[PDB]
Amino acid sequence: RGSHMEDFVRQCFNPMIVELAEKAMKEYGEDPKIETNKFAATCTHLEVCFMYSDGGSKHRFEIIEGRDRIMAWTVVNSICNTTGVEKPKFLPDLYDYKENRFIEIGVTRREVHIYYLEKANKIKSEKTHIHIFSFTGEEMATKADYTLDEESRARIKTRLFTIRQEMASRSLWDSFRQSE
């Protein structure tokens, strides 16, 4: 129960992000006390989605990730019925009103190439945009369209590498990398 990874995640991430990740994991029947690597990954993905939405304009991004399943699906339904974009098979992460498209954010511990391959093979909706970040500073977006400016993506990559460094300083990075 008393794992180093859980305490590190509680010390490293914002309390609201921790609570959101806990709720998202408990909604799918997962315990952050035992599945600590998945807990860290969920916190990281949440923080990345939030930083991504922070970029761009004020009314640019509609945030899907973070809400519970029912409200998230309701928001996607409203977006689809308002704009006319095709309904995605799986719950995306954000919606860009400027580009008028759903965005799926990915955070991987390996090369962005194979991760984007799997993410584009698991979903068949070719309209949804995909954006993958790595823990080493690499990024990969659909049609070479990175949506945001270079500064926001650079901040995201810097935060990711800081998280990796803090994990390695506690001898927890190897297990986290092998978990994925």
Ligand SMILES: COc1cc(CCNC(=O)c2nc(Cc3ccccc3C(F)(F)F)[nH]c(=O)c2O)ccn1
């Ligand atoms: C095809 O994705 C899905 C997605 C859902 C909706 C809820 N989940 C997510 O949102 C989500 N989930 C993962 C990891 C994951 C977890 C469970 C199943 C698949 C995956 C993934 F994405 F690796 F395929 N990472 C993300 O980055 C992310 O956002 C429901 C079903 N499938």
Ligand SMILES: [Mg+2]
């Ligand atoms: Mg800290």
Ligand SMILES: [Mn+2]
């Ligand atoms: Mn998601």
Ligand SMILES: [Mn+2]
């Ligand atoms: Mn995602």
